[PDB]
C-alpha cells in the first residue's frame, strides 16, 4: 500500500494513506532515496494519517513523497551469520563485508516472555574481578547493570567483562552499541579482531555486533537496543543455548525516547522525561531475560546523569536487575579502579545458603569495617589522626588496606595503570580479605595492596618497596 508524507518536523514524519492504514509499529519505506530510510509507525493521528519516527536523517524529504508499507515491523537478519558482522537499527551491514546471506529474519518488536517461562535457577559465575566476586557476585543468566556518572569507568568495566566472561563461555555473544561513541566502536571491533573473537576469514567468530551510536538520530537510537536484543532472542530460543548480551549504553534508549516525546504531542513528565518512561523500559527489559527455553546473561552499562542516582532513568532501572555494580566518582578520584562503591552494590545471590556462610560473612565483614571507617573519616577530617584510639587506627589501617585490595589492574587498561592485568580466582579472593580482617598483614605497608592480583602479590610488593 502506497502513502504520502504530509508533514516533516525533525525526526517526526506524518504520512497519509488513502486506503488501507498500516498498524502501529510497522516499518515504512520512503521512496526516492539513495540510502534506505525507514519510518516506524508510532501513532494513528486520525483522518487516515499516521505519525512516524525516522530511523535516519529527514533532510531532503518532500511533502507528497511516496511511502510504502512493508506489512510488518522492522525485520533484521538473525542466526550464526551475524557473528563477526556489524549491523545497524534496520539490519544493514556496516562492516563493508557485503550482504548478510540468510533466509531467516525476525521482527525487532516482540512480546515479552510470559511469567510461566521464568527460571528461578541461580548459580554464581566467577568474573575474576575481586570487588564483584566478593561483594556483589553475578549469576549465570542473571541481569547485570553497571551504573556510573560520566568518566567513572562504565565502558572499561564492560570491556573487560567481555574479555573475561566470553572466554569462560562456549556460546555466542551480542554487543549492542546504543547511542555511544563511534570511536569506541572502532576500538572494540579491532580489539576483538586482535583477540581472535572476531575472525574475518572463517566462521569461528563468536561475537555479533549491533551499532547505533550518538551520531544517529533519536529514532535510530531508540530502536537499536531492540535490534541488539532480537539477535540475542534468536540464539536463546531457536537454539536453546546460553547467550551473553552486552549493552553500552542502555540509558541512551531512554534519552532517545525523551528527544521525540514533545513532537509526538506528549505533555512532559518529571525532570523533563517522557510520561512513558517506565512502560517503555518495561516492554524492552522484560524481553531481556532467561527463560526455560534458554539462558541470557545480560550486562548493561547504565549512565547516571550528573551522577545523580535519583534521576528517573537510572532509578527506574534498578528494579530490572539482579546484580548491580554502582561506580563512584569519589572512589575514582582516590585512584581505586574499578571505582566500585562497596557500600552501594547489591547481588541478591548474596545469601549464606547460596554463596556459602564463609563467603557471605567475609563480604559483610569487609562492608562493616568500611562503613565504620566512613564514620572515623569524619573525625580525622577535623581533629586529625593523632586523636584516634589504638583500636581506631587499627581498623583504619585495615580499612585502607581493604580499599586498595578491592582494586586490581585490568587487562584492557594497560595504558592507564602501567602494568599488565590479571584474573583472581574466587577462593583466593575470600581468603585474601579474610586474612586482612584478622590482622595478618598489619605489618605490611599500605601501598602493597594497591593495584595487585591475589594476596600473594601484595606480600611480594612489600619487599619491593624497601630496596
Amino acid at each position: 500500500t502506497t502513502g504520502r508524507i504530509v508533514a516533516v518536523i525533525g525526526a517526526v514524519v506524518d504520512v497519509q494513506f488513502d486506503e488501507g492504514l498500516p498498524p502501529i509499529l510497522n516499518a515504512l519505506e520512503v521512496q526516492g532515496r539513495e540510502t534506505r530510510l525507514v519510518l516506524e509507525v508510532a501513532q494513528h493521528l486520525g483522518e487516515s494519517t499516521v505519525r512516524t519516527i525516522a530511523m535516519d536523517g529527514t533532510e531532503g524529504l518532500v511533502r507528497g513523497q511516496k511511502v510504502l508499507d512493508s506489512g510488518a515491523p522492522i525485520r533484521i537478519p538473525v542466526g550464526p551469520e551475524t557473528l563477526g558482522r556489524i549491523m545497524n537499527v534496520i539490519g544493514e551491514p556496516i562492516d563493508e563485508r557485503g550482504p548478510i546471506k540468510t533466509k531467516q529474519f525476525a521482527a525487532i518488536h516482540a512480546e515479552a516472555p510470559e511469567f510461566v517461562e521464568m527460571s528461578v535457577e541461580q548459580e554464581i559465575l566467577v568474573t575474576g574481578i575481586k570487588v564483584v566476586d566478593l561483594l556483589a557476585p553475578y549469576a549465570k543468566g542473571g541481569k547485570i547493570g553497571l551504573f556510573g556518572g560520566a568518566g567513572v569507568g562504565k565502558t572499561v568495566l564492560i570491556m573487560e567483562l567481555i574479555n573475561n566472561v566470553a572466554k569462560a563461555h562456549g556460546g555466542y555473544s551480542v554487543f549492542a552499541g546504543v547511542g555511544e561513541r563511534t570511536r569506541e566502536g572502532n576500538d572494540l571491533y579491532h580489539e576483538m579482531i586482535e583477540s581472535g573473537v572476531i575472525n574475518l576469514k572463517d566462521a569461528t567468530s563468536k561475537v555479533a555486533l549491533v551499532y547505533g551510536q550518538m551520531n544517529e538520530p533519536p529514532g535510530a537510537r531508540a530502536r537499536v537496543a531492540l535490534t541488539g536484543l532480537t539477535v540475542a532472542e534468536y540464539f536463546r530460543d531457536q537454539e536453546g543455548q546460553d547467550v551473553l548480551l552486552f549493552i553500552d549504553n542502555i540509558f541512551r534508549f531512554t534519552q532517545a525516547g525523551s528527544e521525540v516525546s514533545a513532537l509526538l504531542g506528549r505533555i512532559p513528565s518529571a525532570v523533563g522525561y517522557q510520561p512513558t518512561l517506565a512502560t517503555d523500559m518495561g516492554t524492552m527489559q522484560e524481553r531481556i531475560t532467561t527463560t526455560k527455553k534458554g539462558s541470557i546473561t545480560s550486562v548493561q552499562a547504565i549512565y547516571v546523569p550528573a551522577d545523580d542516582l535519583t534521576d528517573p532513568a537510572p532509578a527506574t532501572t534498578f528494579a530490572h536487575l539482579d546484580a548491580t555494580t554502582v561506580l563512584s566518582r569519589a572512589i575514582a578520584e582516590l585512584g581505586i579502579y574499578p571505582a566500585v562503591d562497596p557500600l552501594d552494590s547489591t547481588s541478591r545471590i548474596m545469601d549464606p545458603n547460596i554463596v556459602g556462610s564463609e563467603h557471605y560473612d567475609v563480604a559483610r565483614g569487609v562492608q562493616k569495617i568500611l562503613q565504620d571507617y566512613k564514620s572515623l573519616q569524619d573525625i580525622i577530617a577535623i581533629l586529625g589522626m593523632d586523636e584516634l584510639s589504638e583500636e581506631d587506627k587499627l581498623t583504619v589501617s585495615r580499612a585502607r588496606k581493604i580499599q586498595r585490595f578491592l582494586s586490581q589492574p585490568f587487562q584492557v587498561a594497560e595504558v592507564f595503570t602501567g602494568h599488565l592485568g590479571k584474573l583472581v580466582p574466587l577462593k583466593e579472593t575470600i581468603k585474601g580479605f579474610q586474612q586482612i580482617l584478622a590482622g595478618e598483614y598489619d605489618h605490611l605497608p599500605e601501598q602493597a595492596f594497591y593495584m595487585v592480583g591475589p594476596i600473594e602479590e601484595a606480600v611480594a610488593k612489600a619487599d619491593k618497596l624497601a630496596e
Binding site: 533532510e59 572502532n186 538520530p217 528527544e259 513532537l263 550528573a306 586529625g384 592507564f416
Partner: protein, 485 residues
Amino acid sequence: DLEETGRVLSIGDGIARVHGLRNVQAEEMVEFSSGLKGMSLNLEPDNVGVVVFGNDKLIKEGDIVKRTGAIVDVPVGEELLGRVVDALGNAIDGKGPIGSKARRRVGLKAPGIIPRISVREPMQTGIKAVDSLVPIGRGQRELIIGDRQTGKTSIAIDTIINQKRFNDGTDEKKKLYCIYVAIGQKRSTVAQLVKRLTDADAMKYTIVVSATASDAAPLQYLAPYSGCSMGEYFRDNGKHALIIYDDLSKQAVAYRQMSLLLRRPPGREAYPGDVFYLHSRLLERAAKMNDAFGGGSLTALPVIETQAGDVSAYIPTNVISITDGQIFLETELFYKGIRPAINVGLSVSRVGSAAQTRAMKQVAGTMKLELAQYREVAAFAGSDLDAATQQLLSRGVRLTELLKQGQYSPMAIEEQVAVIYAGVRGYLDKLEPSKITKFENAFLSHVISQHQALLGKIRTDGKISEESDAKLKEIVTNFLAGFEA
C-alpha cells in the same frame, strides 16, 4: 507555480510562515524577494516554517519565496587560511574574495566504524597541565569547561599559538591547521582575538569562523557545522586540523530561540528535545582516519560555560557525556594563583598516555596518583602530621606550583619534561614553595642557553635517555644548591 515558489503568510521574530513551496525539501535553503536566505525546518500540511538568515523588516506578507534546490554549503580549502569569515563562509575581514576551488555540505554525517583508527598522534597544547595530566590526541574531542573568566578561551588560544613550531618545520604529518569558531561573541572581542593571533604569526594557518551576537540565530546555529566542514577537508585529504567551538553554550541558546518560535514545545530549561543531538552529531564528526582514507584527523575543542559552577545543568551534562574528556576550570583556583585554573581531580582524558610522547609519559605517569595522594591529605590536615603524610603534602604542593604557567608562552615538550623531572624526582621537596615559580624561570633559561644539546637530544630521541637522565640530574642538583643560597 506553488510547487517551486511560495507566498509569505506571516513574518515575525525571524520566522516566516510560507504558503506553497509544495516541492521544497526538509532543511532546504530558500530565497526571499529581498534576496535574504532562509532554511525550511518545519514542513506542515498548510505551511512551511522558514528560519531567517538576517533581519525580517525586508520580509512582508505576500512576498514571494523561491526554491534554490539545495541544502546549505560553505567554501572549503587552504584558501581560507588567514581569513575571517561568517557562518556561510563569506569573507568579513575585507581582504578580498576567498579564491576557493571547492564547496562542501554542512550537514554531512560522521565517519562510521570502518574508516577510523586508534588515536596515536599527540596534539600538543604547550600547556604543562594539559600535555601531562589531560593529554589530547589527534582526532579526539576534549571539552574546555568552567565559569566565566576562568581562562577557557585562553587554553584554546595558547594551543593555536603552539602549532607555529610544527607549521614552520619541514615534517608535514607533524603539522596542524587551526579553526576558531566564534559563536555569539561581540565583534570587538573577535577582532582583538584576531589581533592576538596576527602578532603571534598564528593567522597564516588559522581559519576564523565568526557568527557574532548581532547575527541572526540561524547564523549562530550553523557556524559550528560550517567550520567543521572546513576542518573535514583537511581530515579527508591526509592532513590534521584542530577546531574550537567557542562556545556551544551560546549556540544552544540560538537554537532554542529558533525551536521555540517555530512553536516546537520546550523541555528542560526551555531547550528543545533534540538539543543533545545538536552537539552529538557535531562532535562525532571529529575523527582519526585510517591510512586507506588518508591518515588525516580532526580534533575538536568544544567550550562550555557553566553558571556558578553548576555542572549539573542540562547543556553541560550533554557535552561531558559526548566528549573523550574534560578540562575543568574554576575561579577559586584562578584567584589562588593556580593559573591555568585546571582542577586536576575533575579533569580527565580517555585516550591517555597513548596521546603522549615517550618522554612525557615517563614524568607524568607518576604525577596523577601522587597528586591524588596529595588531595586526600590536603582536606585531612594544624594538629601536626607524621613524617610520611607531611611528605605527601610537600610533594603535592611543589608539583602544583610547577603546573602554574603564564599566557602566550606555550612550551615545547622537551622543556616541559625537564621542569616536571625536577619536581617529580623530589629535587624540589625541601625548597620553599614560594620560590618554585622563580626557580622554573631561571632554571629553564639556563638549560635553554647553555644546554641546547640536552633538550635537542630529548626532543629528537623522544624519550629520556640514560645519559640524558644522568645529565638532567647533574644540572638540577647543582642548580638547587646555588638557588637555595
